[PDB]
Paper text:
AMPylation (or adenylylation) is the transfer of AMP from ATP to a Tyr or Thr/Ser residue in target proteins. Interestingly, in eukaryotic genomes only one [name]-domain containing protein has been identified to date, [name] or [name], and it is strongly conserved from C. elegans to humans. Here we describe the first crystal structure of a eukaryotic [name] encompassing the two TPR-motifs, an α-helical linker, and the [name] domain of the human protein. We demonstrate that [name] forms stable dimers with structurally and functionally integrated [name]-domains and with TPR-motifs exposed for protein-protein interactions.
In addition to apo structures of [name] variants, we have also obtained structures with the ATP cofactor bound to an E234G variant and with ADP bound to either the [name] E234G variant or to wild-type protein. The adenosine moiety of the ATP and ADP locks into a hydrophobic pocket formed between α3, αpost A and the flap loop; the side chain residues forming this pocket are Val360 (α3), Leu403 (αpost A), and Val316 (flap). The GNG anion hole (residues 368–370) accommodates the α-phosphate of the nucleotide, mainly through direct hydrogen bonds to the polypeptide backbone. A Mg2+ ion is visible in the E234G variant of [name]; it bridges the α- and β-phosphates and is coordinated by the conserved Asp367 side chain. Interestingly, binding of ADP was stronger than that of ATP. A possible reason could be that ATP adopts a less favorable conformation within the binding pocket compared to free ATP, a constraint that would not apply to ADP. The measurement of the dissociation constant (KD) of ADP binding to the E234G variant determined by isothermal titration calorimetry (ITC) was 160 nM.
Author numbering:
A (entry chain B): 108 to 208, 212 to 434
B (entry chain A): 108 to 208, 212 to 433
The structure:
C-alpha cells in the first residue's frame, strides 16, 4: 500500500516524511503485517526497541508465521524483558530512597491528597478546580455555580480513601469481593446511592470495549479476587501486580460508574501494602491512559504496565527533591 | 401540695393564676393523682373535655381506683370518642370536596411539593430556604455558602418521594420491610451512604425515649409490617392508621438518622393509598409534634392522632381555596 512510499522515503533522508507515511498505512490497516514489521525495523533506528517489540509482537498475533516479524521478535523478546526489569529496579532504588525518611515529607503527603482527588475526578470529566476541591473537603460547604453531583464525587473520594487507610491498608489477610463493594459504596454513594456498592444490572460500552454481561459479573469478580490472593500475583513485581489488578477490574467493569476511581484506588492499596507511595494518573494523561488500556484489550498488557511504572517513577520523583 | 393554693385561686376569679399553680404542682409531680383530677375538673370549665379526659386517663394509670378520676372518666370517655369521631367525619367531607375537582388545584399541588420538602427537612434542623430548595431541585446546582449535607438531604427527599410515587403508591399488595429500607436508602443515601437503608447497630437516645436495642430492631420491624398489612389496621380510620404507623416506626427508631423523614413519608403513602392528599407537619409545629410523641410514649396515643388529623384538615383547607 502506502508502505512502499514509506520505505522509499526511509532510503535517503526524509525520516519525518517516512514516519508520517508509516502512521497513515497503519491508520488505514492497523492489522497490516508488513507495515507493522517495517515500522518496527524503522523504530529500532530511533533506539526505540520497546515500540519495535510491540510492533513485531502485534504482527505475530495477526500472522503467527511471518518470517521478518519472527526473526526480529525472537531477538527483541528477551531484550525488552531485561529493559523492563531494569526499570523496575530503578523504581525499587527510588522507593529505598523515599522509604529512608519527618516534617519535610509530611508537607508533600498533604499536598498530594487534594492532588490525587483532583486528577482521579478530573480524568472522568469533573470540572472542579484543586482550590474548589480543597474548599469542599476543608469547609464541607458547597462551591457556587458548580453542580452538586461533581461535588459529591469529591466527598465520595475522600470517604473511600479514608476507609482504605483506616480499614484496608494495615489489615492482615485476603482481599474479598465485599472490600471492593465497600470502596465503591463510598466512591459512588453520595452521587448514586441506589447503584453504589452494587454490580451492573445492564450491559454497557467502555470506548470500544464491551465488558462481560451482567449475568457473568459475579463469576468474573470471584475469579478476580482469587487472582488477587493467588501465589503467582504475590510473586509479581508490586508495580506489575498493581497495573494488572487495575486493568483486570476496569476490563470486568462491574459497576455502572466509578470503575476507574475504584480501580485507581485498588491499585494504590496494592502499591501501599508493598511499601510504595500512592500514585496519581494525571488528567493530562487520559489520552495515553485510554490508548494503553485499548492496547491491552488488543492483546498486549505491557504498554499499560510501563505507563503505570512511569506514573510510579514521576510520583517517586517530586517526593525526592521536596525532601532533598 | 401547691394544688391547695391552686384550688383556692379557682374559688373567686383568678383563672390564669390558678392554671399556672396547677402547672407548677404537675411540674413537681406529674404523677400527682389529685393534681391531675383537679386540673381535669378545671379544664372542663374552659370547655376542654379532650384535655380533661387526658388528665383523668393519666391519673387512672397511676391510681386505677381513684373515685373522683373514675366518675369523671366514665362520663368523658364516650363523649371524647364522639368528639373525635365527628372530627374524622369533618375530614371525610373535606376529602369528598377535594376529590371532586383542573388548573386551580394544579397550582397548589406543585407549590406543596417544595413545601413538603422544605418542612420535612427544616423540622430536623435544615437551614435551606424554599427558594434554595427550588434552586437545588430545578437546577441540580449547589447553593452558595450552604453546607453540602443540607443540600443532599433535599436530593434524598426528592428521590424518596419520586420512588414512592413511581413504585409504591399505585402498587397492589402487602408493604414489606424492604420497601421501608428502599425509602430510607434514598432519604439518607446522598448524606450517609454507609448507613442508608441499613438498621441501627448502636443503642441511641431520642430526647427522653430509649428505642429498642439494635438486637431487637429486626423482630420489632417484622411485627410492625405485620400490623401494616393486618385486617385491624385496614379497619382503622385512614387518619388513625397513618398516625399510628408513624408513631410505631418512630418509636422503634430503626435507623441512626432519617427516622422522622421516613415516618412522615410512610404516613403519606398510607393517606394517599386511601385517597387522601399527602400532608405536611410544618417546622413551627416541632414543639407540639414532640410533645404529642412524648405523650404517646407516656401511654396516650390520642393527642398525636388529633395532631395528625389537624395537619390533615389544614392541608385539606389549603386545597379547598380552589372551590
Ligand atoms: N478500552 C477500555 N477497556 C477497559 N477499560 C477501559 C477502556 N478505556 C477506558 N477504560 C477505563 O474505564 C474507566 C472509565 O469508566 P468509569 O466506570 O466511568 O470510571 P470513573 O467513573 O470512575 O471515572 C476508566 O478507569 C478507564 O481506565
Ligand atoms: N419522644 C420521642 N419519641 C419517639 N420519637 C420521637 C420523639 N421525639 C421525636 N421523635 C421523632 O424522632 C424524629 C427525629 O429522629 P431522626 O432520625 O433524627 O429523624 P430525621 O433526621 O429525619 O428528622 C422526629 O422527627 C420525631 O418524629
Ligand atoms: Mg464516570
Ligand atoms: Mg436527625
Amino acid at each position: 500500500a502506502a508502505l512502499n512510499q514509506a520505505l522509499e522515503m526511509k532510503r535517503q533522508g526524509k525520516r519525518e516524511k517516512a514516519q508520517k507515511l508509516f502512521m497513515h498505512a497503519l491508520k488505514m490497516d492497523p492489522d497490516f503485517v508488513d507495515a507493522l514489521t517495517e515500522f518496527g525495523i524503522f523504530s529500532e533506528e530511533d533506539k526505540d526497541i520497546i515500540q519495535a517489540d510491540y510492533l513485531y509482537t502485534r504482527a505475530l498475533t495477526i500472522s503467527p508465521y511471518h518470517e521478518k516479524a519472527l526473526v526480529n521478535r525472537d531477538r527483541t523478546l528477551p531484550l525488552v524483558e531485561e529493559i523492563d526489569q531494569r526499570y523496575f529496579s530503578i523504581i525499587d532504588s527510588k522507593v529505598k530512597k523515599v522509604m529512608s525518611i519527618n516534617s519535610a515529607l509530611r508537607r508533600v503527603m498533604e499536598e498530594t491528597y487534594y492532588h490525587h482527588i483532583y486528577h482521579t475526578v478530573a480524568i472522568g470529566g469533573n470540572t472542579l478546580t484543586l482550590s474548589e476541591i480543597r474548599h469542599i473537603l476543608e469547609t464541607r460547604y458547597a462551591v457556587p455555580g458548580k453542580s452538586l453531583e461533581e461535588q459529591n464525587e469529591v466527598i465520595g473520594m475522600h470517604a473511600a480513601m479514608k476507609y482504605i487507610n483506616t480499614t484496608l491498608v494495615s489489615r492482615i489477610g485476603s482481599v474479598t469481593i465485599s472490600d471492593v463493594l465497600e470502596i465503591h459504596r463510598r466512591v459512588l454513594g453520595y452521587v448514586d446511592p441506589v447503584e453504589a456498592g452494587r454490580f451492573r444490572t445492564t450491559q454497557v460500552l467502555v470506548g470500544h470495549h464491551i465488558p462481560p454481561h451482567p449475568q457473568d459479573v459475579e463469576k468474573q469478580m470471584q475469579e478476580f479476587v482469587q487472582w488477587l490472593n493467588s501465589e503467582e500475583a504475590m510473586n509479581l513485581h508490586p508495580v506489575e501486580f498493581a497495573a494488572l489488578a487495575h486493568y483486570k477490574l476496569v476490563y470486568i467493569h462491574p459497576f455502572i460508574d466509578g470503575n476507574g476511581r475504584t480501580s485507581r484506588l485498588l491499585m494504590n492499596l496494592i502499591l501501599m501494602q508493598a511499601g510504595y507511595p500512592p500514585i496519581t494518573i494525571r488528567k493530562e494523561q487520559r489520552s495515553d491512559y485510554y490508548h494503553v488500556l485499548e492496547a491491552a484489550n488488543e492483546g498486549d498488557v505491557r504498554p499499560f504496565i510501563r505507563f503505570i511504572a512511569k506514573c510510579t517513577e514521576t510520583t517517586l520523583d517530586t517526593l525526592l527533591f521536596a525532601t532533598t
